[PDB]
Amino acid sequence: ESADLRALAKHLYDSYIKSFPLTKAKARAILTGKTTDKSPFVIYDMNSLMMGEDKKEVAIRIFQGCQFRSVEAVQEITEYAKSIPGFVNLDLNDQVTLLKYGVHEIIYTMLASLMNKDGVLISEGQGFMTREFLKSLRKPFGDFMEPKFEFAVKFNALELDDSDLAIFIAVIILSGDRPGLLNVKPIEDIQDNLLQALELQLKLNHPESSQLFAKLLQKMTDLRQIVTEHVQLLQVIKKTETDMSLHPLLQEIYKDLY
């Protein structure tokens, strides 16, 4: 029954607002300057960057900033997952598995929310780091950012809002094909229901957007390639920056990943 699917959509959206302090609506508002008293500090060079610290080398400092952002995101995403119906009753190991494989896909999905073709918002939106600056970073760090912008510009053209994103994120977390899942069936059952709520949500919220549902599903698969590309660049860094290491939470998510 459709009424149930709308209640599911609504519960997911409310859970999303409770889990993610900075929403896409608030981010587009900041990026387009349609917010009250607060335009973000712009980081576009070494100097700009240094100025920001108040309000090692460059590439490394930005890399670890992305890491702290990432560890924070894992915690927010984890809380959101605990509010998806049926999720907490799944085998605790499959919950870990779903999270281990799904968290960065959501990070990049959500990261698109803070991006436009020219840069990305940082630290709860108090800063804006230009795309050109991120591209000036010493190899291999520069190519960490560009493919995210490439996906984000195309992802954002789909015009999904927060209520759309909430179901989209939920469908991603509940993927029965993650490696090493013990109980596939109950995960697919919850995902089938989430997929029906998503289809209805996209049809009611974007009645004129042709084949939006199918386009969105494709993006779910694209996100996987994004992660793959990312992990292989991290392999490089682990190998050529032997004195560097990832934050503990990230190390645990990345080990034995695929």
Binding site: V74, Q75, T78, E79, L92, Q95, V96, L99, P248, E252
Partner: peptide
Amino acid sequence: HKLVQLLTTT
């Protein structure tokens, strides 16, 4: 490990 503690916190 850390994931487990985050998953079961209330």
